[model samples]
Target: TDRVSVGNLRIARVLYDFVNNEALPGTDIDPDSFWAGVDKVVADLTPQNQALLNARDELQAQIDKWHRRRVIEPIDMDAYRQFLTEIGYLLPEPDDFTITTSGVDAEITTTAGPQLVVPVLNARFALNAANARWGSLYDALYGTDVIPETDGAEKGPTYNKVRGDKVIAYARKFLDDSVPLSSGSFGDATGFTVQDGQLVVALPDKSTGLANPGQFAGYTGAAESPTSVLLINHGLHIEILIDPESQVGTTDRAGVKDVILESAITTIMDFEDSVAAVDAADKVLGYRNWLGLNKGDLAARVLNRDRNYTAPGGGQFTLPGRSLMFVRNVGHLMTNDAIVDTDGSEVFEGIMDALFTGLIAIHGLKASDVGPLINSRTGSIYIVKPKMHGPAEVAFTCELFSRVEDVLGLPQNTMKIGIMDEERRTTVNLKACIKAAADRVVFINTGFLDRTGDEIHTSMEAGPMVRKGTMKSQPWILAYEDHNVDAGLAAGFSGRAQVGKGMWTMTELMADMVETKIAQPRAGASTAWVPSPTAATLHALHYHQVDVAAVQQGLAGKRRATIEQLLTIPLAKELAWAPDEIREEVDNNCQSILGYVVRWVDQGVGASKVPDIHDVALMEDRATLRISSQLLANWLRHGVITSADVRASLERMAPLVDRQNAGDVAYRPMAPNFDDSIAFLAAQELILSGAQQPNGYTEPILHRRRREFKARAAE
Candidate 1:
């Protein structure tokens, strides 16, 4: 059967072999009884997984029934609130207490910087993200549009001297402001020398030193004529490369070649949402990459390692070369055929991830013996668990993490969780959700796309939603965003953990991003997501601009958005959408759905920047797709659009989407044969049946379509 029986459990031979031959062999795990332990845990927890999903369905039905009863206007939200409480959807708030989470890395607690979430299945991208802990500030500005492409500084085939000057100017300003020098600008520096245990910046006329000598962490090479000077501000590191003969430095007074900024402080190696792992083969790739990350041997040639330096006091020190890694696991919703049970059904994928990821993390945790493997200098595995509902589901995960620790003979609370407060239930009852895993929770992140999807689905029967463009300005959306930080702060996350913000979608618009994204750190988010390593470099500037710890200190024990506001539905007050406006909205949503889903189903590319109909490249994954699909489903249901209108748009948008992907050689055109296209059919199903999807998730349909595509290709 290609499925091996491990006592009461049936694991795919591929998965079982991986455990015994690869994942288990390097550790002190008892191979003889490990499978038996997994079997027992699966037996105990599978019922709870089913019950949690069942509860999701139960709540959905109840909400739909209530919304249908109050079909007209002037409804009482207070009564609606009572109904939710009566059904136990809103559990009583937990008593006030701070999180006792420990062993978190300084990247999470003391430092604030850019974070990258990459699909673990693609090993190269994972390596890029890990290596992105440091990036050349000069290159980040010179290459990206962050530096204005005007004034003969156009970015093209030739390296524009003007562009280079602007980049140098911007970088020097960054250094001057971030780690300011006393009585001189960084632009005027000609040389650097460590003297009296401080950095002395030599100017044209006289020598000036650091305004704050504490910022001078270290240097490389001779102290008098240092090849590189390292600086620190807001817990992020900066390395100033001094080279007189280098291309950019030859003409410079300071001989400064580059400024390397510490970026992407932590990277989330995502096994969910950003990845399409429908079967064992796909999941194995993800697991293997995660394992490789922990084992420090996933040989992607292009990566970085630790940078050693001489401290100001002449002591030697080293900084981590790569970003501190967090391996994200799938939630409790989907079951995978990676392992099956006695009943001939698959084990919950989340449980599989928990057991496997936990076991793999040992390679990193026990690095003292093996010599500094890939993560957690403090002996903890950071697993960002996504899509959990409210307090109960969080408790379920906390219990599951503990069970894993016991199964693997690890210490209690060694597997720390990062709660993704993306679900509506979790957003409204956030404090309670934090309480459920307060002892082990290290992150509480807000993802608007998924959270918005849930919002639309939760109130699908209530009325039509505002346009997708307008959804951001809704009362509930801001409430959701504000309360995430509020909840995290009230529970004592500052300097102890991360309160994160979601991804910036405009990957190409770095200049625009640099202008606006500082609000995240200013608003007390210790870390926020960026799409690329380059984006991470640019985003690191934001953390330097605002002290997130200072912001958090000012915001502790605050309540910006209450549960009443969080629960307020974003349903349209009246039919404000003109036919033209509706057409534009539908077209945008449909095109986006087709644009993303085609790659997901046909090619198995989980996340990338897809060109919209307007020709703007927006980075997207399943969460973005979920929001669009749910919105369309709502519009169709509420008579804002029809099956015919959606069908027409899908057909119309397909040709345009084909044009968008025409550049890729591997791409298959979705138009002209829509009937035969599996991807097109999947897109249709997503829009048509989104109302009935569990929690408005895209995984179930996307998984099936991807498997079907894979099957046909194999044939």
Candidate 2:
């Protein structure tokens, strides 16, 4: 009863008791002092938060007016730049500076590999991601097209020996390329042994040393009869496990059981974008899980086909090495009912996230705390702050964190920030943005989905945006991606912090990812986002093959992408699109939004593989929804598609989305009768009211409708 509260807010008494009694005991801070600190910070900062949001609206209004005035005029880059400057859309460049961020974990600062984003709402997903620091290279190869799935290697439910042999051959070739023998191929080696601390691969004729003897790091079992041989290349470790008793091992000359690839060097425990936390109850659940992880005690009980198992959080691995962790809190644009200010208005979800997550992370700082060893061993807490606009907003967030530390008795710079270089202003003025949190910056990643969403919203007045696919090829996006790395390196992030790229969205398309996503490391990024842990395992192979630090060294002082290119608006070349093309685009956008939104509203599922138009499963989240909804909203505003057309498209695509999800027994269909589904109404609102929503965010409407559905179901 003491923990329970009414009045539209739900700050759980259990959590409050834990924080006040346990977390603050010897931290030299008390309950009154802590709450007062939070009070002062919110009271003083809320007005400033309102002001910054106002500035966004004001700038957008001017930009929109200007675009309308020049709708038919020929493009003038100079005039465009001037107008942006005059309207405060572009700020003056800051003096040259490099980040002094300290207490950074090695995974963020030194290691280069794939980073995974997993929904923290699900304990099993969290544990799987955390433990995914090492994955089976043989499995990753045999299961997917990393080896050809065609020919004799057809991977059905049954394990074909032909496919198994191909997997072994491919893995052997990888060994030859990365950890080669002195005189012969790994395929030719009949036996492997360590003699006097050196690995000797014995062929038919004689023994040979490794091409790079230093590749042998350590072994698991014994030097002469090691069960698993660990080899290092490009700072990533791989293991050739020897198991003569196993099925695959008995067939091998060297008795190799598996090839384990050190994958997912860093994982993001995501509470935003990839999760559905609509009301106070949902948010509390997210926060509680986050706290459990921070304390290193989160767990889940999973039921397999015939057995039930308990899955706890991940601990350090003795094999490949430790996996670094980061928590992605919600952004500044949305509000949640988890806590309300003086007027009963939903508190800024980002501010609450900064304070609460920062509070929970104190558990990681003390070795006696609950969870496994975590992100900041140097008393630093890494929080990836998303969706802040420009330098001014970044400054506000830095100030917010400073206040939180003072409130909670944290040492200055103990809470390191990871800036999501997603918004247009943050990307354009990225260097200055980093400078805002120079003392505590740890990570900077480009998010394609959120960045594109912001791109459409910021320039809705300029003209119709290029088609969703065409936007990627446009000058602005290319420059934005390039500038992120250049700016990060320029800011001295080369060895001090992570320079990351966006997620590989297509979960099932590993072949395409293997070919293309390697470009992230080659382009000098130390880490890039992957949608799943399995994808993390596959992408890790890229890191083993490429030394990102070497690439970064070569990229030093490279010509930075010009700001002029970044400022190039991605407007449609032609104002008019064919009727059929317009309908096709509308259908595509509607299907994506509806499919993703329905799960969030109806079942409270956050991120999953939602079927696109061609039946391909792509990872869908709030960012993906934002882009699709905003694009449709933009098109509708320009009369490229009428309301009737949107309605018809939604009506038509609703069945397709329903059909795509027909296998689900619990699914509620939205086709034929739209009014019966609040999710459908919300989807329709996203396009119909797109121009009116702030920043074209779909959260407010989606959350409200979802909460309504939950309450009605309870009734």
Candidate 3:
């Protein structure tokens, strides 16, 4: 329905120009054939795409009605399950089958490690993520509070030798536990040498080789006195560099400068969730960055310390490793003013993303250069499609990718899908959802925030929701987390693909992440999301502690989570709260919202380290905001709080949020008055607009108001 032409260019001009002038020219694709193919593909698939979205709305309406009718009824598990099945909300499970996905990279197929999700709108971030495939384990430990800042061993402006020793001791213990020595502890080792192809360590007690000699894979520098010894445990690589010339190394008994952990095995270059692209101009920037990455030409020149630094896309390291990449497109829930259709209607941004981004990815899929440039060496385009409601929508995305292949003159199933198992209906019918895209499915992961937001919205009529923190302990959440892994495993994702868990939201809490996130791999998940590269390096330690493939093999035939538990709603029946507790909850929610929302609206920065009430910096994006806004709205509707109270909380939290950002020179304060402040207005709308939002999403109002602010600033 889009205008056939905007001036001389068609609605598909950016896509066509990308494929023709850039992608296809060197790739040997016929221009006329490509254009005709795209037209035919769009013609064949657009109606079905619309129908899938309609199906989502219809199913949501049915679920809404069901919950509304049961508003006052006691929790009846059997009746709820029967009703869901009756309404086609639950589908019959298929007979047990393993995933037959092949040609997957070792990162996804064989390795169990951390993955990063970075917004693609920022070239610097994309470059950072790509290069973050390897990180210094020592730096990850010492720089953070993971190494206790104790005994006056406080982290000063410069390096603290005492804290550094603690970090080294901890890292050596990790190496000892993972790949041990035959004789003594690594802490007692004075020197390391690769003698006769063996990793020989000369300890105070005796010289010894690794307990498992196979763990000593390779080394750099001279064979007799190697500087860097490479060790492989649980299929992940770690490099220990013995550089006596370096300051840090000179202080060490083994002269070890650093331990580089092979981390961020896969990174999702995101166009959604983590980005604040709201209009056509913003969309073009995202598309351009993606194109740059696929072409191996993406670069960002940033000013650091009054000097210009040009950062470029990372190539395959000569250092012996690979990092798989995925592109996360926007969901089906939002529309964009990128290009208005012939009927004056805004086109679904997701559709444009699917078509254009898919087209751009063909360059990477078919490139012949074997050197460093490789996006998918297996000839598959990995796209992490988020926020689909159920199997029908999943199938719609599968079909859309199929059409994209046709347009790009690529093979069917060339574009592999990573389902964000982040919605309730999708979780309930997990197998069916996978079955819909079985031929092309490569990855599936749980997302806590988006999943939780859907949980709240799906059960809006059940009762007031539990406090946001309490939601983590809900029955349905446990089932959803467990079921996601069990279901993905049941579908045989063990060796062929990734069965993943969600992000470690508390980026600054590496000690806690280390203590807790081991459960992801222990639960047979091949990969999980880490907020940053440092987090990736730290989280990679988990893979070393637990052999995930072995864990998966052992749990292969284990009983999957019950469908009843997966379908159970996490509705809060007990809404009784002390007055102070209610105020504290509201204040916490409002403060977080203002902290993140202010940055998003005022600076167009979507993802950031948002400090909580306790000054803990947590990684946050739209999904985090979505849950907070929806939870507050649910409480409001259930008489848990008043509008005046909410407004007062927002006003009070504004200055605290302002103080949170006082360090930023560009920050515009929202307190004293809400007028002339788009950020403040955006926050107000999130609360006031939450009820009217379709499925309680924050995108529509945020995108619209953000675009308006951008337009005025441009004028």
Candidate 4:
């Protein structure tokens, strides 16, 4: 029931049982030596972990001083760039190299589609996300804001005939745009037939094949009357379901019931920003889910279950029914009590995650361990390392993965890394970071919120910044987006790896997303993040509209953005916000911080769609609060607003958040008695003391408040 010593390490009893008994049995690893082997590597790397954090703090200090020195004058960027290189804030670029990562799945290298990131702390959400490989096109359109709710076309629990008609019309237009007919539109089709491995559509007056006859992949049921037909475009799958017996099909001239699109090609099971694992017990819960997923035995009464189809040659084949998964580990910063070193200090959480998750992944590597989940047909385990500072940190992570491979008796490069280009130092020196793990790196992603969080923190002393709304139009952000794709394409990411973009935070606004999100693929990225199964289904529409590989092909060896653009700081010309603008900004940022923080601290919900000041729900996590908290903190530091103004705004936003959560039965209000409310106080300290926070991270404060809330509950 308490901590016990094992091989010069102090192990929590609960953790020892979970790893030795539950996680180790089927992987051919003996429980007797697992912890002993892990402790040796953890001990050697403990000091290196501390040194990296010290390096980040030291680099930030130098930048802060430079900013303060030029406080009264317009900054000269050329001098600043050189100073950054001289002070070791920007490392030298490595020589050109293509990633030699082998055993990568087609989902990452060839097929380009939507990627979903779900909090691993939620078992139900994880199970559903895994099953989100394919989703209904009609459902994705009918249930969301994608289709306008004009007149009688509004949604309802019962069938709205008008809405039903709109969904089919919308889907047919997508088919016309994606897989066009030779002569007529899909809307005029009366039936479908397969002819000599070619799809032939039957119109009222004439029969026509696809404009591109090779688009047909396969079909199911019969050639004369098929239950479903499969087509391929831009390496993504599209399936059409037909049934005369179904209600919706009864209304269709072609007897088309529904269409299914391959969606969420890859899902990141995250243990980082989207989770609230504060202690040994909390971390074990997340690790246990990863163990079950790796071992292919998470029986949550849970699509997560494989599918089958018939090929054109009368041969049968099966398609993967789940999205390929990437496990996102915590960064190098945090420490956990799950394991303690010989000196009685906690082991790095990133180190523990690599050891545990790598060992568990072996269950999916072998034929005997898994009957079907077949996670990586290529025998690779993807662990995305987030929030790392520079090339040295990337090198450190790949090395830690190497040691984990040795412990598990796997070959070299067996564990792959996804480098998150979220920090300023990592972004500026991205090519070198990629070079550091070139042999094992298969993915690189850009996050707007996380990158912006680091941006404001890294330039905290650069005077009052422009409003958050002004950031998107800034030179640096555009260059940030362009440069991410440029470096990935320049490094030959075209066919060997994925170049990804950030999340579409608004889940309900699928209409706007469909119209605009195509820019990601057109901008030469192979993948982008989605928040739901329906969002992924809708996002797949963009993939078909733009061939990402062809885009990457055109952008190869060309860099559209420059270092000068990237180094252009987003500092305001003057602190000239009106009183109304200040009040609106304060209220907006405070509401966002309070809405997300309350659930995280009081109810242990790590990521949820919290309503903003305008009552629009947003899928938010700690990275979001990081921006909100640091903005208020920066304003206080630059004298744009007094501390009392922020406190007053926080007090006002508390009850508004309380009013929003009034419908929840388990709601805990942060108003009326603000002094006793743990979440309220945590929100204040996150802003009031933000300048002192390391890289302006919100985890330290959130984790502590949640612990105190737990302690208070137990009493």
Candidate 5:
């Protein structure tokens, strides 16, 4: 590979050309000034980034020593708090203030709905996620377990009339609850027509209107016989498509073919945990796709095998693409080979991401650039910065963004920041963290899995942790969730920015999601992550059921969560566990680790639905790996499980993972040659040395082994 020297830095040829030729062409930035700016930012901020990382290690060492000394003594909460404060691990709370962020799009500011995080390397998935801004509620219901296939209503190769009936009934019930008629239910309506901007529903005996007539937004086709009607409830749009000759519509009394729900309000086009961009080439691919997205020229060819669908007009169509994309850069920790500094060492990936992504977004910011879709009408670039430790690190990020803007000739705070409040330090000092990026912060979310992993690792020497399944019930978990909202609301996030919840991990369990995921809105979260567009459509109903803006209003000025409660470590007091229970825990964690790592290492699939021990497939990513590996490490540290026990579990679970993936033609078996499989060894190292990883993250091991696999495959 050829290299280009830009001042004190050496950039890979592909990455250099991508920025100079593609990303900077339509933008105001010139190549020379852009590279010079990058050079200056790297030279100035790299040391500060390193120092912040060093601070994390220093704090961890002090906490570990404190825990070890008191291992035998009874708990001392007050003393523990004092020690943390002395070491500067916990900072004093800041004075009351509100965020002054402006120019944010409605998706982040006002709308309440599901958000999707897709790997940007795959153009198709990225495009699908982009188009997932709207989805068919009828398809979401008929295809998933949300509508149970009982009572002769089984989903099959061909469309089942019984299942279609159930789907229509469910959709009508949703309309009744969300956009109700004045006199009768949606089921009683025989037709729909728009008259004088009013949605007039035709019943058998009489005409009726929406109980809340303002719910009707607009319509398509002639008003007397419309093809689609748009309705708004709780700031989300629902489109009712009508066609008398359609397959499902022919059977409906109202001729309703589909009910399209506004879903995936904002999608995080992830370049971090959900992607396996181990080298310069992989990073360039992701960067190019993002560039295309920003320019509205990103198109992927669709094969019949990939996706073939019939439209409401009876014409076969392919993928409907693109979501409002928010690029999630790498955290402050890792460095990438895409560029190297004066010392010939890898540059901080996060810094590189800030400059390059912000540069590409200038295409969208241009007033003359128009296409099939516009990502941000407000002319702002959304970058979700993950894994920053505390207020200081967040301040460093804001400074980095400031430098990038100056270099690229963009306005200050044009690059908005989404703070992932996943780490222990950030969780405890969340208000200060938000304040540090007050001018640029548009998003703050709770990451349950990663936060738990950090919690366990931060308090590794404290004791054996509660079982992974029991972590959610711990006091700290509740306090952490509440504190994230309380801080965001207190900092004026309500109607000005997003306060998001974490992902719903179970992709197939839509019925349970429909019944339970409503809690996110009631908890005052404007957005939450869903695994797929289908899931997003179903979860959208929850937003309509509970008005998130109203929820945030009611939650305002309520007594906020205490810092002491947020600092409470969830350590198990008792060490006694049945032998079978111990084995079950080891088996579950081991299976999950092996299942996810295999595809990640061998196929370069960073995130996917992997089958668990019970054959239930859940969406697995690095967050899942982090918590599972960290749990086993915590157990091994406290002697609740031995190395031999973990080894046996891995050896046993390897074959099961192999059997589970046997049907995949691309799968390379991990059994019978465990020594030869890089994935297997990587999983082992993740657990055995998990306690030593920075913040209990799996990235270091995964990146190293993935690079090795790429090298061997090249050989």
Candidate 6:
């Protein structure tokens, strides 16, 4: 790849041409001024970014020393909190404030539903997520484990009416729960009619209207025999498709084929943890997809093989063709060679993403005629920033966005921010972090995986952590979840911005999801992450069941979680683990690390449903990887595990992971040539060096090993 000289900065040829020829042409930005601004921003912010990262290391070192000293003494929670506050790890809470962020889309501000986080590097996945706004409830139910397939209701190669009945039964029950009838159940109803601006459901004898006629938004086709009845609840749309000729509809009493749920109201088009964009090419690909999406021109070709099945009556169809997109920029930690300062140093990736993504969004912002299909209706560009330490780092991001806005000649707060409350420092000081970006803050969410990873690393010398699963039961974890919602609500996020929860990792277990995942909304989260579009559709029902706005309102007057609880470290009081227990833990963590890293390093697949040690597939990403690696590192730091134990587990799990991925043709086996496999070595490195990595992030090692793999492949 050749370098293109743009002003004082030396840029990658691909990225430079991408910016000038593609990204900037449709926008009002001048190419020269754009690059000039990028140059100045990179030059000015790089030092500050480095200082913030250095501060992280300094704080971590101080905490590590404090923990090491306390190894001989009993743990002191009060002294620890005092020490953290004194060392500036825990900043003083800011004065009560409210976020004045305006111009946010309804998906962020008003409506509550599932949010999808898709890697922008994968165009097909990106397009699918963007278009996941509407998904079939029937398809979601039929495909997943939500519907039972026992007693001749097997989901085979052909359509099973027995199973279809179960699906319809469940859907009707959902309808009853969501939009109840004034008289009869949906199953007993023979037909549906819309008359006098009201939905009329025909029973065995006569018709009865909806309990709340306002739920009936509109209807398609003849009013007497509507093909689709549109309904609304909790600000999300649900279309009941009625067609007697359809296979599934013919068996139904009301001739309903499928229920299309408005799914994935917001999607985070991620460029950070979920993507493997180490260099210019990968970054450009991500940027190009984002640009296409912002311009409403992003599309991906789907092969017949990729098509699962057609909707009952409708043949093959693509989706919303685009969903509301939020570009998740890299945090302040990493730098990229996509563009370099005049002194020949790599520029911060976060700064680059902010400027470029904002620049590309100008196309959507400038084109007022694009309507709802446009990325942002209110002329705002959403950027989900991950992995910032505390208020200072957040303030730096706010400043960076302001600089980008100034350089691009946009409004002051045109760039709205989604704060990821995953770091311990940020979690404890979340109110202050929100206050830092209050003017432009549109989101705040809890990520247990990343937060736990940071917790383990930040307190590596504190003690051996409880089992990874046990961390959820800890007081700190509960407080972390509650505190995120409390802080967001305190900052007036209810009906103003999103208070989100993390991803549901199990992609196959919809039955369990239906039973359990509703807690997210009930816990006052307006939005939560789902692994796929199908999950989005299934998860959308939770929003209907619990009005998140009402939940937030109810939670407003409640007592908030304390910072003392947030600061409580989830350390095991006793290290009473049998040899078998230790081995099992190591094997599980090592297998997961290898399973995810192999694909990440060798194939550049940042996020995937990698099978665990028990062959249960998990949606693995850098966040998951962080927890696994940090757990192993923490165990090694204590006497519970050793370098030999970690290495032995990695070696033992190599063949297992290779076997698990045997169906993937592109997968390179790591068993016989484990010593020579870059992926295997990278996994080993992540575990061995996890404690030393900044904030326990897996990006630095993963990026290096991936680059090594790419170089080797080129050779």
> What is candidate 1's lDDT per residue for 494-520, written digit by digit as tens?
888899998988888999999998888
> lDDT tens string, model 2, 135-186?
8887887777777778777988787888888888988888998887887899
- Candidate 5: tens digits of C-alpha lDDT, residues 1-715: 3789888899999898888788888776677988888888999999999999999999999999999888464467788889989999889989989999998887788888899998988899887887888889989999999999797899888999999998999999999999989998889789988766678999999999989888877777777888888788998888889998899989999999999888888899899888888888999899998887777777794211112333333344442233567999999989988998667799999999998888887775653243333567687899999998999999999999999989988789989999999999998889899999999999999978889999999999988988888998788888899999999999999989999998888989999999999999999999999988899999999999999999999999875677778888888877557899899999999999999999999988888889999999898568889999999999999889999999999999999999999879999999889989999999999999999998898988999999999999998
How many clashing pairs per prediction, in order? 0, 3, 0, 0, 3, 1
Local lDDT at 114 for model 6:
96
- Candidate 1's C-alpha lDDT? 0.89
Q: Give me candidate 4's TM-score against the actual structure.
A: 0.98
Candidate with more favorable, higher TM-score: 3 or 5: 5
Q: What is the C-alpha lDDT of each candidate?
A: 0.89, 0.79, 0.80, 0.87, 0.87, 0.85
Give each model a TM-score. Answer: 0.98, 0.94, 0.93, 0.98, 0.96, 0.96
Residue 314 in model 6: lDDT: 29
Highest lDDT: give the candidate number: 1
Candidate 3 per-residue lDDT, tens place, 415-525, comes to: 889998988989988888998988888889987788898888777777788888888878888988888887887888888789988888898788899999999999889
Candidate 4 lDDT tens digits, 390-435: 9999999998998888888788899999999999899999999999
Candidate 1's C-alpha runs over 4 A off are: 368-371
Ranking by lDDT: 1, 5, 4, 6, 3, 2
Model 6 gets an lDDT of 0.85
Clashing pairs in 1: none
Better of 1 and 6 by TM-score: 1
Error of 6 at 628 (Å): 1.1
lDDT: worst 10-residue window of model 2 = 303-312
